[PDB]
Amino acid sequence: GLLDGKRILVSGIITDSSIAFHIARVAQEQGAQLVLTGFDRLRLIQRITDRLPAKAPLLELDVQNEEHLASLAGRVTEAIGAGNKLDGVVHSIGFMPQTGMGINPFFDAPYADVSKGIHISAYSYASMAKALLPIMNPGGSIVGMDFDPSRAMPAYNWMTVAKSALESVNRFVAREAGKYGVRSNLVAAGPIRTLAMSAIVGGALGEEAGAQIQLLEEGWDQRAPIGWNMKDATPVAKTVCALLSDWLPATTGDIIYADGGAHTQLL
Amino acid sequence: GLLDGKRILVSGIITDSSIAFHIARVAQEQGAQLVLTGFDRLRLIQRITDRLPAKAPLLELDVQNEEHLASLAGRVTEAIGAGNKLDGVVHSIGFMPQTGMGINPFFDAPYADVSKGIHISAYSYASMAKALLPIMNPGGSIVGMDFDPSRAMPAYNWMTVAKSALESVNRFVAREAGKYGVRSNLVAAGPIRTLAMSAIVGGALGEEAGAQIQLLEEGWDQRAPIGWNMKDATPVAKTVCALLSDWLPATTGDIIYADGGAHTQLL
Amino acid sequence: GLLDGKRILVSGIITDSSIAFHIARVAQEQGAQLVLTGFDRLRLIQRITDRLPAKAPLLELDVQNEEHLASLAGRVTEAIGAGNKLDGVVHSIGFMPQTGMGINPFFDAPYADVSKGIHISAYSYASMAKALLPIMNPGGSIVGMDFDPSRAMPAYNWMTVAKSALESVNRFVAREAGKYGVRSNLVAAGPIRTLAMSAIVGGALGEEAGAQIQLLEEGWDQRAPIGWNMKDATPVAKTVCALLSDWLPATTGDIIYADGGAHTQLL
Amino acid sequence: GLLDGKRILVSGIITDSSIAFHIARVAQEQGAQLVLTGFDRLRLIQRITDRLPAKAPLLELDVQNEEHLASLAGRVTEAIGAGNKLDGVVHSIGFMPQTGMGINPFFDAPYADVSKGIHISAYSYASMAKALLPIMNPGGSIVGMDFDPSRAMPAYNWMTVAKSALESVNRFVAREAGKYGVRSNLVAAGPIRTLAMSAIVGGALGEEAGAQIQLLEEGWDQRAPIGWNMKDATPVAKTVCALLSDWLPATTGDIIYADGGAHTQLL
Ligand SMILES: NC(=O)c1ccc[n+]([C@@H]2O[C@H](COP(=O)([O-])OP(=O)(O)OC[C@H]3O[C@@H](n4cnc5c(N)ncnc54)[C@H](O)[C@@H]3O)[C@@H](O)[C@H]2O)c1
Ligand SMILES: NC(=O)c1ccc[n+]([C@@H]2O[C@H](COP(=O)([O-])OP(=O)(O)OC[C@H]3O[C@@H](n4cnc5c(N)ncnc54)[C@H](O)[C@@H]3O)[C@@H](O)[C@H]2O)c1
Ligand SMILES: NC(=O)c1ccc[n+]([C@@H]2O[C@H](COP(=O)([O-])OP(=O)(O)OC[C@H]3O[C@@H](n4cnc5c(N)ncnc54)[C@H](O)[C@@H]3O)[C@@H](O)[C@H]2O)c1
Ligand SMILES: NC(=O)c1ccc[n+]([C@@H]2O[C@H](COP(=O)([O-])OP(=O)(O)OC[C@H]3O[C@@H](n4cnc5c(N)ncnc54)[C@H](O)[C@@H]3O)[C@@H](O)[C@H]2O)c1
């Protein structure tokens, strides 16, 4: 296995179409031993993760909760056994209140809503690194999920701002993680049809937003020299595993694009 | 004058070494009629602005205050006369609590502090545009101040994250401002010895931070093919005026670098 | 005038729809004294430039000719009067053999053809700077024309490669020009309907190429928050003049986008 | 092995300190079957490659020779057996005449010299893809070696221009390779002490150039959050293998940085 022998924490599973679900599956398929973290709906998450090809302890983590973060490393050591450390950490967490996205005008998102989304989507990447670096091995790897924010786009609005912040946060985390011999990188994925995304295409955030996202997705597949399949999260999961492995040992504070190559093409 | 006939709002004056002070002076020298906004220390700001070559009404604006923002456009119309509109807006506002900068570890900044700094330094750019676009003329120009955050740097820490967010916010504001025939751009300046900056070089934020900033400044002048004078804000002020003029009419959602060309050179 | 008192060399006029024609007109309108250079069809170019609002000496310059380059500075001093120096230089020159563009497959362009196009389109920017820097004043400005090559696009093929090279060349020229107190920058323009461009939309380079360029142009106007008018070179000409003026005195080795803001937006 | 079962062509071995030598070794260690190409000194190259952990046919390829390129695919099919196709191609080829580098002024490089270097260093990436795509399997991978040219640097001069061109060429090759289900990417490596590099540090290209390169190398290790060891090409070789594997299946037309993370940090 690509990840034979590695212990890896994976956050952000909420359904079987979560990107993190597929990351965890591929990791296990490749020999990794996992510990999982979940937010709020733990009974639901345990039931969902029963389907992973191997068993994995599930810990609760609300990244807005300072007590969960304070105790996190202790709980992970319990789950993996004293004297053992993590080789990998996957941050697959994101959220923006509805007022910060969709047909709600960009200017009408209240700061308290934006702030919550930046807290969960960007700041928390630093939070998790802080909690977990003290229990990671040299040669370890932290990975977060990015959506390319270098240009503005319809509908995504404040979530795109949050991703811009996350990319900057990642460059600082690399500085800190480096002292532990640990790498920190983001994977910028193409659009993937998770439950939330389908809901949005379905009009959950307004009809104009839905039309624009659908148009965004189609342009993506068209631009990608190898195509893009929004229904298949597997190529994204493999890329995260590549970064978790020993095969990109000199890459840190960086962004790997798993997007079909769409971002390298104009038309 | 470059700005003959234009009405321009300029925020962010707090001392005579403020970048906004120099922006206002050059603007007046070039024919602009100004309205100013100031935060908290209004008696002090009025006394400082008495030195500008022309008189200009001073309005109070705390960008964290929804009532100031709600009433802002009304107060500006009063100051410039009903039936008159702004041709320009200068956002020169920034702040990060001390815990988000300097030798205080990156991981130790509490979210409430980071959030305040992102509110003032990034979100407020959207806030001001929202308040002011309804009273701007076609062909108008909004300009904000940026410090190039595309790479991590010592000491600047969470302020750099805030600037990453601001750059993303600027691209969205351009989308909105475009409907009014208005441009939105940032100026990325080299480091300038304002009062705060000198204090930091002096060790106000820890000795290690001060040493790194001083080293940052020296490397800048060295890399800049035309040099960089941290004691002279004038070349920055001129660049902002260039963007306020009619001479960059097809540039928007963009960043103009006034940094001596330092960012284009590695060594 | 924005350029009152400045002496400026402007290359690249071949017809009245040339971008350089419009650059020269706006410059003269703003007080500049011009010297022009033309390639090959000098009788035609003189007849075209008779229409400029002021008279200007026309010198012959084939940038592939080492003797023209060797003698250039001497001929310019003759035209503007001994003891006088240039304040500005405009490089508006570009060419790629047909085999390097359009429906001719990317892989089928012979190196000799690509090389000719890189010579004229990229190397020559360094050539002109070398010839002219010895006769420029401190505070001077060199400007070249760019088409944003950071992403691949249909049809433009090897010309896009040439522009990638030009951007890199510009960063080096800034290093050299800096010793003379001279700036060097590119303007990245949106697509403009010159004679060549219309011919291409008309199918001169194959029907598939024409269809793609037309589609490129439409997407541009759509993405640009302030729109893009491919039939109007004026906003581009003004931007070049902005860079020729004293109003961007700390910008060098850089790229200014005059493209309606299209490159800052994804959809 | 990471590359179990894959057939891979590797160019650019000239000594045992060549980056391509280390790429080939790691590939073989990971299960790949190799075919090698060499330029000019074939007796020397065969003797050097005898040290690889497995045997591999050596073919002659001068990328400036149209007959070598025309016959290349035929010769590779012979070496790997009719009915067999390549899964991978490594372009590790670069050259710039001495006049285009070092203390020789940037402006003094003659175009014929620059052109030769762009031919070998940039155009040839397209040349090799053209020759080899007809004999590659779906899911295949082409990889080239890059040195980050996004900013100008002392000494590297026209070689940096060549790399700028190569990055642009790579984005076009991805467009073509995509039709075959093949990816195309570059690896941007930190500086590595090959024979040529040591010679340059030793003053082979002038003392000023040597001093600047040495200073470049030191700054690199300092900026890299995980450090950079210029004497160890292994982390670069692993990264190339990562791209040759099935573990980055949605990345194309892109650049992966194997540079210690140096390019993500300012100071
Ligand atoms: N779906 C896409 O098209 C797309 C594309 C690129 C990147 N991404 C990113 O990938 C990541 C995963 O998203 P997804 O598409 O798998 O969506 P998802 O809804 O399946 O998962 C998002 C996860 O974030 C968790 N979360 C929300 N608030 C939390 C908090 N307070 N504490 C802990 N966890 C919290 C949710 O429980 C959920 O598990 C996100 O960062 C997203 O921005 C998504
Ligand atoms: N000084 C530098 O080296 C440097 C470099 C590049 C960019 N910048 C940016 O330029 C801008 C101006 O900074 P400066 O260097 O002139 O510093 P400064 O201290 O002189 O001005 C900052 C201004 O922000 C104002 N401010 C703070 N909180 C506010 C709030 N709640 N509401 C309204 N105003 C508020 C302050 O009153 C002050 O006037 C900032 O955005 C800064 O980040 C500074
Ligand atoms: N038209 C567009 O959509 C567009 C967009 C962005 C940038 N540009 C760039 O603007 C510049 C001007 O192009 P244009 O659109 O005005 O086209 P144009 O055909 O009007 O002008 C190109 C000029 O280059 C000159 N030239 C060709 N070979 C030469 C040589 N050997 N020596 C001296 N001059 C030579 C021609 O005489 C002509 O005057 C070019 O660099 C072009 O790439 C064009
Ligand atoms: N050494 C570094 O610090 C560094 C850093 C980043 C990228 N790179 C790149 O890595 C690649 C390999 O370089 P290296 O450092 O291993 O140097 P090297 O000298 O060991 O290898 C360069 C190879 O290019 C070959 N070559 C030259 N002309 C050729 C031609 N006409 N046809 C076929 N082959 C030809 C040479 O035979 C040699 O094998 C180059 O592209 C280089 O630019 C090098």
PDB file of N, CA, C and O in Angstrom, chain A residues 148 150-154 212-213 215-216 219-220 223 262-267, chain C residues 148 150-154 212-213 215-216 219-220 223 262-267:
ATOM      1  N   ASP A 148     -10.040  26.651  -5.874  1.00  0.00           N
ATOM      2  CA  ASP A 148      -9.224  27.746  -6.443  1.00  0.00           C
ATOM      3  C   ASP A 148      -9.905  29.119  -6.432  1.00  0.00           C
ATOM      4  O   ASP A 148     -10.801  29.371  -7.226  1.00  0.00           O
ATOM      5  N   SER A 150      -8.447  32.201  -6.908  1.00  0.00           N
ATOM      6  CA  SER A 150      -7.573  33.259  -7.410  1.00  0.00           C
ATOM      7  C   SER A 150      -8.338  34.236  -8.318  1.00  0.00           C
ATOM      8  O   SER A 150      -7.879  35.350  -8.577  1.00  0.00           O
ATOM      9  N   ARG A 151      -9.528  33.819  -8.744  1.00  0.00           N
ATOM     10  CA  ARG A 151     -10.427  34.668  -9.522  1.00  0.00           C
ATOM     11  C   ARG A 151     -11.824  34.616  -8.928  1.00  0.00           C
ATOM     12  O   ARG A 151     -12.236  33.598  -8.392  1.00  0.00           O
ATOM     13  N   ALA A 152     -12.558  35.715  -9.024  1.00  0.00           N
ATOM     14  CA  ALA A 152     -13.906  35.741  -8.477  1.00  0.00           C
ATOM     15  C   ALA A 152     -14.833  34.903  -9.350  1.00  0.00           C
ATOM     16  O   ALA A 152     -14.587  34.705 -10.535  1.00  0.00           O
ATOM     17  N   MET A 153     -15.891  34.385  -8.751  1.00  0.00           N
ATOM     18  CA  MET A 153     -16.859  33.601  -9.500  1.00  0.00           C
ATOM     19  C   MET A 153     -18.268  33.839  -8.954  1.00  0.00           C
ATOM     20  O   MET A 153     -18.441  34.194  -7.794  1.00  0.00           O
ATOM     21  N   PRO A 154     -19.280  33.686  -9.804  1.00  0.00           N
ATOM     22  CA  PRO A 154     -20.663  33.823  -9.332  1.00  0.00           C
ATOM     23  C   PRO A 154     -21.004  32.846  -8.203  1.00  0.00           C
ATOM     24  O   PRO A 154     -20.443  31.760  -8.147  1.00  0.00           O
ATOM     25  N   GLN A 212     -25.802  29.348 -12.458  1.00  0.00           N
ATOM     26  CA  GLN A 212     -24.402  29.753 -12.600  1.00  0.00           C
ATOM     27  C   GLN A 212     -23.454  28.625 -12.210  1.00  0.00           C
ATOM     28  O   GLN A 212     -22.451  28.397 -12.884  1.00  0.00           O
ATOM     29  N   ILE A 213     -23.777  27.916 -11.131  1.00  0.00           N
ATOM     30  CA  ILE A 213     -22.961  26.779 -10.707  1.00  0.00           C
ATOM     31  C   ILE A 213     -22.992  25.694 -11.771  1.00  0.00           C
ATOM     32  O   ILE A 213     -21.955  25.134 -12.120  1.00  0.00           O
ATOM     33  N   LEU A 215     -23.424  26.072 -14.889  1.00  0.00           N
ATOM     34  CA  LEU A 215     -22.626  26.600 -15.991  1.00  0.00           C
ATOM     35  C   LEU A 215     -21.123  26.573 -15.674  1.00  0.00           C
ATOM     36  O   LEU A 215     -20.294  26.318 -16.542  1.00  0.00           O
ATOM     37  N   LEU A 216     -20.787  26.838 -14.421  1.00  0.00           N
ATOM     38  CA  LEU A 216     -19.421  26.693 -13.931  1.00  0.00           C
ATOM     39  C   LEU A 216     -18.905  25.262 -14.151  1.00  0.00           C
ATOM     40  O   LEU A 216     -17.818  25.069 -14.692  1.00  0.00           O
ATOM     41  N   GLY A 219     -18.281  24.329 -17.876  1.00  0.00           N
ATOM     42  CA  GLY A 219     -17.110  24.979 -18.430  1.00  0.00           C
ATOM     43  C   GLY A 219     -15.852  24.282 -17.959  1.00  0.00           C
ATOM     44  O   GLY A 219     -14.867  24.207 -18.677  1.00  0.00           O
ATOM     45  N   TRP A 220     -15.897  23.771 -16.735  1.00  0.00           N
ATOM     46  CA  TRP A 220     -14.772  23.061 -16.153  1.00  0.00           C
ATOM     47  C   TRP A 220     -14.390  21.826 -16.961  1.00  0.00           C
ATOM     48  O   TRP A 220     -13.245  21.670 -17.379  1.00  0.00           O
ATOM     49  N   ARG A 223     -12.858  22.843 -20.323  1.00  0.00           N
ATOM     50  CA  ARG A 223     -11.489  23.387 -20.250  1.00  0.00           C
ATOM     51  C   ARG A 223     -10.438  22.338 -19.891  1.00  0.00           C
ATOM     52  O   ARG A 223      -9.280  22.432 -20.306  1.00  0.00           O
ATOM     53  N   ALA A 262      -8.086  22.093 -15.559  1.00  0.00           N
ATOM     54  CA  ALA A 262      -8.932  23.230 -15.956  1.00  0.00           C
ATOM     55  C   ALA A 262      -8.333  24.631 -15.714  1.00  0.00           C
ATOM     56  O   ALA A 262      -8.509  25.531 -16.540  1.00  0.00           O
ATOM     57  N   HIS A 263      -7.629  24.814 -14.596  1.00  0.00           N
ATOM     58  CA  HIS A 263      -7.147  26.134 -14.202  1.00  0.00           C
ATOM     59  C   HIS A 263      -5.956  26.573 -15.041  1.00  0.00           C
ATOM     60  O   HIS A 263      -5.507  27.708 -14.929  1.00  0.00           O
ATOM     61  N   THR A 264      -5.447  25.684 -15.887  1.00  0.00           N
ATOM     62  CA  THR A 264      -4.285  26.035 -16.698  1.00  0.00           C
ATOM     63  C   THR A 264      -4.706  26.453 -18.096  1.00  0.00           C
ATOM     64  O   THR A 264      -3.855  26.748 -18.938  1.00  0.00           O
ATOM     65  N   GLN A 265      -6.017  26.460 -18.342  1.00  0.00           N
ATOM     66  CA  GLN A 265      -6.546  26.704 -19.681  1.00  0.00           C
ATOM     67  C   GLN A 265      -7.560  27.833 -19.657  1.00  0.00           C
ATOM     68  O   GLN A 265      -8.377  27.922 -18.751  1.00  0.00           O
ATOM     69  N   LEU A 266      -7.534  28.695 -20.660  1.00  0.00           N
ATOM     70  CA  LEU A 266      -8.472  29.820 -20.659  1.00  0.00           C
ATOM     71  C   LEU A 266      -9.781  29.436 -21.319  1.00  0.00           C
ATOM     72  O   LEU A 266     -10.855  29.628 -20.749  1.00  0.00           O
ATOM     73  N   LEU A 267      -9.692  28.886 -22.523  1.00  0.00           N
ATOM     74  CA  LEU A 267     -10.882  28.439 -23.231  1.00  0.00           C
ATOM     75  C   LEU A 267     -10.641  26.992 -23.657  1.00  0.00           C
ATOM     76  O   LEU A 267     -11.566  26.265 -24.056  1.00  0.00           O
TER      77      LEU A 267
ATOM     78  N   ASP C 148      -2.088  38.324 -22.147  1.00  0.00           N
ATOM     79  CA  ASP C 148      -1.965  37.429 -20.975  1.00  0.00           C
ATOM     80  C   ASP C 148      -1.807  35.944 -21.322  1.00  0.00           C
ATOM     81  O   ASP C 148      -2.766  35.296 -21.718  1.00  0.00           O
ATOM     82  N   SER C 150      -0.781  33.392 -19.252  1.00  0.00           N
ATOM     83  CA  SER C 150      -0.587  32.561 -18.065  1.00  0.00           C
ATOM     84  C   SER C 150      -1.386  31.251 -18.161  1.00  0.00           C
ATOM     85  O   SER C 150      -1.118  30.292 -17.434  1.00  0.00           O
ATOM     86  N   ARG C 151      -2.327  31.213 -19.102  1.00  0.00           N
ATOM     87  CA  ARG C 151      -3.098  30.009 -19.395  1.00  0.00           C
ATOM     88  C   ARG C 151      -3.111  29.760 -20.893  1.00  0.00           C
ATOM     89  O   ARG C 151      -3.090  30.694 -21.681  1.00  0.00           O
ATOM     90  N   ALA C 152      -3.147  28.497 -21.292  1.00  0.00           N
ATOM     91  CA  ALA C 152      -3.160  28.180 -22.712  1.00  0.00           C
ATOM     92  C   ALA C 152      -4.519  28.531 -23.306  1.00  0.00           C
ATOM     93  O   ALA C 152      -5.529  28.566 -22.611  1.00  0.00           O
ATOM     94  N   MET C 153      -4.538  28.820 -24.596  1.00  0.00           N
ATOM     95  CA  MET C 153      -5.787  29.130 -25.270  1.00  0.00           C
ATOM     96  C   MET C 153      -5.762  28.597 -26.703  1.00  0.00           C
ATOM     97  O   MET C 153      -4.701  28.432 -27.293  1.00  0.00           O
ATOM     98  N   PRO C 154      -6.933  28.285 -27.254  1.00  0.00           N
ATOM     99  CA  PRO C 154      -6.992  27.840 -28.651  1.00  0.00           C
ATOM    100  C   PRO C 154      -6.411  28.869 -29.625  1.00  0.00           C
ATOM    101  O   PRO C 154      -6.470  30.062 -29.361  1.00  0.00           O
ATOM    102  N   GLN C 212     -12.969  29.945 -32.658  1.00  0.00           N
ATOM    103  CA  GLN C 212     -12.454  29.949 -31.287  1.00  0.00           C
ATOM    104  C   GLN C 212     -12.087  31.357 -30.833  1.00  0.00           C
ATOM    105  O   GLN C 212     -12.374  31.737 -29.700  1.00  0.00           O
ATOM    106  N   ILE C 213     -11.465  32.130 -31.720  1.00  0.00           N
ATOM    107  CA  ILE C 213     -11.120  33.515 -31.399  1.00  0.00           C
ATOM    108  C   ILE C 213     -12.387  34.323 -31.168  1.00  0.00           C
ATOM    109  O   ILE C 213     -12.471  35.086 -30.208  1.00  0.00           O
ATOM    110  N   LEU C 215     -15.182  33.256 -30.121  1.00  0.00           N
ATOM    111  CA  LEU C 215     -15.701  32.787 -28.840  1.00  0.00           C
ATOM    112  C   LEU C 215     -14.870  33.313 -27.659  1.00  0.00           C
ATOM    113  O   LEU C 215     -15.401  33.631 -26.600  1.00  0.00           O
ATOM    114  N   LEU C 216     -13.564  33.398 -27.858  1.00  0.00           N
ATOM    115  CA  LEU C 216     -12.667  34.026 -26.896  1.00  0.00           C
ATOM    116  C   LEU C 216     -13.087  35.477 -26.615  1.00  0.00           C
ATOM    117  O   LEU C 216     -13.214  35.875 -25.459  1.00  0.00           O
ATOM    118  N   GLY C 219     -16.407  35.835 -24.620  1.00  0.00           N
ATOM    119  CA  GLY C 219     -16.269  35.464 -23.226  1.00  0.00           C
ATOM    120  C   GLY C 219     -15.589  36.574 -22.454  1.00  0.00           C
ATOM    121  O   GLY C 219     -15.876  36.798 -21.288  1.00  0.00           O
ATOM    122  N   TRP C 220     -14.678  37.270 -23.122  1.00  0.00           N
ATOM    123  CA  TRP C 220     -13.953  38.374 -22.517  1.00  0.00           C
ATOM    124  C   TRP C 220     -14.885  39.492 -22.061  1.00  0.00           C
ATOM    125  O   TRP C 220     -14.872  39.895 -20.900  1.00  0.00           O
ATOM    126  N   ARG C 223     -16.977  38.356 -19.059  1.00  0.00           N
ATOM    127  CA  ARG C 223     -16.243  38.260 -17.783  1.00  0.00           C
ATOM    128  C   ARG C 223     -15.843  39.619 -17.211  1.00  0.00           C
ATOM    129  O   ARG C 223     -15.750  39.791 -15.993  1.00  0.00           O
ATOM    130  N   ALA C 262     -11.223  41.350 -17.069  1.00  0.00           N
ATOM    131  CA  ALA C 262     -11.555  39.962 -17.428  1.00  0.00           C
ATOM    132  C   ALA C 262     -10.709  38.869 -16.743  1.00  0.00           C
ATOM    133  O   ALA C 262     -11.238  37.819 -16.369  1.00  0.00           O
ATOM    134  N   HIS C 263      -9.408  39.113 -16.575  1.00  0.00           N
ATOM    135  CA  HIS C 263      -8.495  38.091 -16.074  1.00  0.00           C
ATOM    136  C   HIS C 263      -8.663  37.870 -14.577  1.00  0.00           C
ATOM    137  O   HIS C 263      -8.064  36.959 -14.018  1.00  0.00           O
ATOM    138  N   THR C 264      -9.478  38.694 -13.928  1.00  0.00           N
ATOM    139  CA  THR C 264      -9.656  38.553 -12.486  1.00  0.00           C
ATOM    140  C   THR C 264     -10.923  37.775 -12.171  1.00  0.00           C
ATOM    141  O   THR C 264     -11.260  37.589 -11.000  1.00  0.00           O
ATOM    142  N   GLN C 265     -11.625  37.339 -13.216  1.00  0.00           N
ATOM    143  CA  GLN C 265     -12.930  36.703 -13.055  1.00  0.00           C
ATOM    144  C   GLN C 265     -12.957  35.353 -13.746  1.00  0.00           C
ATOM    145  O   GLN C 265     -12.436  35.200 -14.843  1.00  0.00           O
ATOM    146  N   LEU C 266     -13.578  34.363 -13.125  1.00  0.00           N
ATOM    147  CA  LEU C 266     -13.597  33.035 -13.740  1.00  0.00           C
ATOM    148  C   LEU C 266     -14.778  32.887 -14.678  1.00  0.00           C
ATOM    149  O   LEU C 266     -14.619  32.500 -15.835  1.00  0.00           O
ATOM    150  N   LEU C 267     -15.966  33.203 -14.179  1.00  0.00           N
ATOM    151  CA  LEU C 267     -17.164  33.141 -15.003  1.00  0.00           C
ATOM    152  C   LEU C 267     -17.873  34.488 -14.877  1.00  0.00           C
ATOM    153  O   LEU C 267     -18.781  34.824 -15.654  1.00  0.00           O
TER     154      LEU C 267
END
